[PDB]
Enzyme design. Sequence first.
Site, PDB file in Angstrom:
ATOM      1  CE  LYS A 168      37.008  34.637  84.579  1.00 27.35           C
ATOM      2  NZ  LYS A 168      36.088  35.050  85.662  1.00 27.35           N
TER       3      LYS A 168
ATOM      4  CG  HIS B 274      29.338  39.657  88.286  1.00 29.38           C
ATOM      5  ND1 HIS B 274      28.872  38.408  87.934  1.00 29.38           N
ATOM      6  CD2 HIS B 274      29.959  40.149  87.186  1.00 29.38           C
ATOM      7  CE1 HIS B 274      29.190  38.158  86.676  1.00 29.38           C
ATOM      8  NE2 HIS B 274      29.851  39.198  86.198  1.00 29.38           N
TER       9      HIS B 274
ATOM     10  CG  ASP C 215      31.013  42.554  83.223  1.00 34.61           C
ATOM     11  OD1 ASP C 215      30.999  42.272  81.999  1.00 34.61           O
ATOM     12  OD2 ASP C 215      30.855  41.698  84.109  1.00 34.61           O
TER      13      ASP C 215
ATOM     14  CG  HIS D 269      25.785  39.823  84.222  1.00 32.75           C
ATOM     15  ND1 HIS D 269      26.144  41.137  84.440  1.00 32.75           N
ATOM     16  CD2 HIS D 269      26.913  39.186  83.826  1.00 32.75           C
ATOM     17  CE1 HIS D 269      27.433  41.287  84.185  1.00 32.75           C
ATOM     18  NE2 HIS D 269      27.923  40.117  83.810  1.00 32.75           N
TER      19      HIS D 269
HETATM   20  O1  LIG Z   1      40.178  39.153  89.887  1.00 32.10           O
HETATM   21  C1  LIG Z   1      39.594  40.148  89.374  1.00 32.10           C
HETATM   22  C2  LIG Z   1      40.258  41.047  88.433  1.00 32.10           C
HETATM   23  C3  LIG Z   1      41.634  40.884  87.996  1.00 32.10           C
HETATM   24  O2  LIG Z   1      42.391  39.865  88.461  1.00 32.10           O
HETATM   25  C4  LIG Z   1      42.217  41.762  87.070  1.00 32.10           C
HETATM   26  C5  LIG Z   1      41.448  42.838  86.562  1.00 32.10           C
HETATM   27  O3  LIG Z   1      42.050  43.663  85.655  1.00 32.10           O
HETATM   28  C6  LIG Z   1      40.121  43.063  86.965  1.00 32.10           C
HETATM   29  C7  LIG Z   1      39.521  42.190  87.888  1.00 32.10           C
HETATM   30  O4  LIG Z   1      38.205  42.463  88.259  1.00 32.10           O
HETATM   31  C8  LIG Z   1      37.732  41.881  89.541  1.00 32.10           C
HETATM   32  C9  LIG Z   1      36.270  42.214  89.787  1.00 32.10           C
HETATM   33  C10 LIG Z   1      35.787  42.449  91.093  1.00 32.10           C
HETATM   34  C11 LIG Z   1      34.426  42.742  91.351  1.00 32.10           C
HETATM   35  C12 LIG Z   1      33.530  42.804  90.272  1.00 32.10           C
HETATM   36  O5  LIG Z   1      32.189  43.077  90.443  1.00 32.10           O
HETATM   37  C13 LIG Z   1      34.001  42.575  88.946  1.00 32.10           C
HETATM   38  O6  LIG Z   1      33.119  42.638  87.874  1.00 32.10           O
HETATM   39  C14 LIG Z   1      35.355  42.281  88.713  1.00 32.10           C
HETATM   40  C15 LIG Z   1      38.130  40.419  89.713  1.00 32.10           C
HETATM   41  O7  LIG Z   1      37.779  39.888  90.975  1.00 32.10           O
HETATM   42  O1  LIG Z   2      33.919  39.851  85.674  1.00 32.43           O
HETATM   43  C1  LIG Z   2      35.167  39.935  85.502  1.00 32.43           C
HETATM   44  C2  LIG Z   2      35.812  41.175  85.057  1.00 32.43           C
HETATM   45  C3  LIG Z   2      35.097  42.407  84.767  1.00 32.43           C
HETATM   46  O2  LIG Z   2      33.755  42.467  84.900  1.00 32.43           O
HETATM   47  C4  LIG Z   2      35.770  43.561  84.330  1.00 32.43           C
HETATM   48  C5  LIG Z   2      37.181  43.515  84.180  1.00 32.43           C
HETATM   49  O3  LIG Z   2      37.804  44.646  83.752  1.00 32.43           O
HETATM   50  C6  LIG Z   2      37.921  42.360  84.458  1.00 32.43           C
HETATM   51  C7  LIG Z   2      37.263  41.205  84.894  1.00 32.43           C
HETATM   52  O4  LIG Z   2      38.042  40.085  85.170  1.00 32.43           O
HETATM   53  C8  LIG Z   2      37.472  39.136  86.145  1.00 32.43           C
HETATM   54  C9  LIG Z   2      38.512  38.113  86.618  1.00 32.43           C
HETATM   55  C10 LIG Z   2      39.850  38.146  86.143  1.00 32.43           C
HETATM   56  C11 LIG Z   2      40.839  37.241  86.617  1.00 32.43           C
HETATM   57  C12 LIG Z   2      40.480  36.282  87.578  1.00 32.43           C
HETATM   58  O5  LIG Z   2      41.376  35.371  88.096  1.00 32.43           O
HETATM   59  C13 LIG Z   2      39.148  36.229  88.058  1.00 32.43           C
HETATM   60  O6  LIG Z   2      38.803  35.280  89.001  1.00 32.43           O
HETATM   61  C14 LIG Z   2      38.180  37.132  87.589  1.00 32.43           C
HETATM   62  C15 LIG Z   2      36.058  38.711  85.743  1.00 32.43           C
HETATM   63  O7  LIG Z   2      35.457  37.825  86.666  1.00 32.43           O
HETATM   64  O1  LIG Z   3      29.890  32.990  80.702  1.00 36.93           O
HETATM   65  C1  LIG Z   3      29.235  34.111  80.511  1.00 36.93           C
HETATM   66  O2  LIG Z   3      28.231  34.162  79.811  1.00 36.93           O
HETATM   67  C2  LIG Z   3      29.765  35.344  81.187  1.00 36.93           C
HETATM   68  C3  LIG Z   3      30.520  35.251  82.490  1.00 36.93           C
HETATM   69  C4  LIG Z   3      30.661  36.593  83.152  1.00 36.93           C
HETATM   70  O3  LIG Z   3      29.756  37.324  83.548  1.00 36.93           O
HETATM   71  C5  LIG Z   3      32.126  37.173  83.379  1.00 36.93           C
HETATM   72  O4  LIG Z   3      33.066  36.419  82.971  1.00 36.93           O
HETATM   73  O5  LIG Z   3      32.120  38.313  83.937  1.00 36.93           O
HETATM   74 FE   LIG Z   4      30.177  39.582  83.776  1.00 35.27          FE
END
Ligand SMILES: O=C1c2c(O)cc(O)cc2O[C@@H](c2ccc(O)c(O)c2)[C@@H]1O
Ligand SMILES: O=C1c2c(O)cc(O)cc2O[C@H](c2ccc(O)c(O)c2)[C@H]1O
Ligand SMILES: O=C(O)CCC(=O)C(=O)O
Ligand SMILES: [Fe+3]
Length: 346
Positions: free
Chosen positions: A212, A231, A233, A287
């Site tokens: 990402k 949030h 991860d 974070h």
């Molecule tokens: O779009 C998302 C997303 C995704 O599209 C694909 C994937 O494989 C993982 C993802 O993770 C989601 C998520 C939700 C709540 C959290 O606290 C977080 O860290 C991550 C995110 O919203």
């Molecule tokens: O924190 C994030 C996150 C994560 O922590 C763990 C993980 O396994 C996948 C993740 O992916 C997220 C994400 C993916 C696609 C999107 O379109 C979006 O809006 C967000 C990101 O935000």
């Molecule tokens: O831009 C950053 O330092 C991290 C962003 C983040 O927390 C995420 O993409 O989950």
């Molecule tokens: Fe993060």
Amino acid sequence: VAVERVESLAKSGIISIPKEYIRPKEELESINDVFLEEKKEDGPQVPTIDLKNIESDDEKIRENCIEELKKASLDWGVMHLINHGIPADLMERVKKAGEEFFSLSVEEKEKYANDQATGKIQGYGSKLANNASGQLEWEDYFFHLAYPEEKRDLSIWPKTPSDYIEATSEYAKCLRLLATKVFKALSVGLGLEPDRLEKEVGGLEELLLQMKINYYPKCPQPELALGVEAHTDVSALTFILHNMVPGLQLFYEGKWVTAKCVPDSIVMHIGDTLEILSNGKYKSILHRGLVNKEKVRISWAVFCEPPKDKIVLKPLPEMVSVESPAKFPPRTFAQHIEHKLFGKEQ
Ligand SMILES: O=C1c2c(O)cc(O)cc2O[C@@H](c2ccc(O)c(O)c2)[C@@H]1O
Ligand SMILES: O=C1c2c(O)cc(O)cc2O[C@H](c2ccc(O)c(O)c2)[C@H]1O
Ligand SMILES: O=C(O)CCC(=O)C(=O)O
Ligand SMILES: [Fe+3]
């Protein structure tokens, strides 16, 4: 429906940001100038962990390294890794390529637009409001699976610059090897067999690496918005790179700490998946990310995820006892995400 990108908004001229980007009154109090916060040298600081001897023949030296990694993971759950084994110039090529892609016009980038309505989650996008509040964050991004190679969909990967696919795929390969090393050191730390943790998250076959790229445009009112909301991860491990512009803050001991920029280092986060498996021993920290009005900030986060439906995540047997009851119920990766999203929505 209309398609609004933060980049466009940042160039529309406006000197005041839309109401959808202003945080609630209670939250605004904790947001300060990221540049001044970056200068403060008082209070707890994100640890720097040296991995030079993580796999050294010398037993005493190897254990000292493993022990330092273990301690930081149990306390902070996040850290600056150095001497991690990933070529510095390879990292430079990955970042240069990402900067060239986002340097293209919004109209050009829209050709890679994602479409959640039809399940196409990979590509260029910006977070859509998903609940009553209607809150939005100050960032655009590009998301795509980077490993295993056979599971990739190269058709949606940037074609400009010409070397994006080449540099990104090699970097992904290097991170995969580093993940295996971290997983073993962490297993040993919990008193488990070396290959235990990586096996529980899918091994070489099921473990996924998602890439990402986060793009944070300049903000006319940086103290009213957030680049990324607060949030944790949901991954097992997260490895991040950035363009030396401050922005990441960690909620430690009830206070928001600002991370400093350490040259050639790689930020690593312990994620929810490892926190659940270790029954809370390894920490998945809260974070967020700040924006500013003077410099565009960019980051490259790689999330190591377990298969979304194939594995049921819960504290390992060895980590649960009558005196240490399970801190989380059984759930899959997909179910865990839905549970967290169901929380905010409600
Ligand atoms: O779009 C998302 C997303 C995704 O599209 C694909 C994937 O494989 C993982 C993802 O993770 C989601 C998520 C939700 C709540 C959290 O606290 C977080 O860290 C991550 C995110 O919203
Ligand atoms: O924190 C994030 C996150 C994560 O922590 C763990 C993980 O396994 C996948 C993740 O992916 C997220 C994400 C993916 C696609 C999107 O379109 C979006 O809006 C967000 C990101 O935000
Ligand atoms: O831009 C950053 O330092 C991290 C962003 C983040 O927390 C995420 O993409 O989950
Ligand atoms: Fe993060």
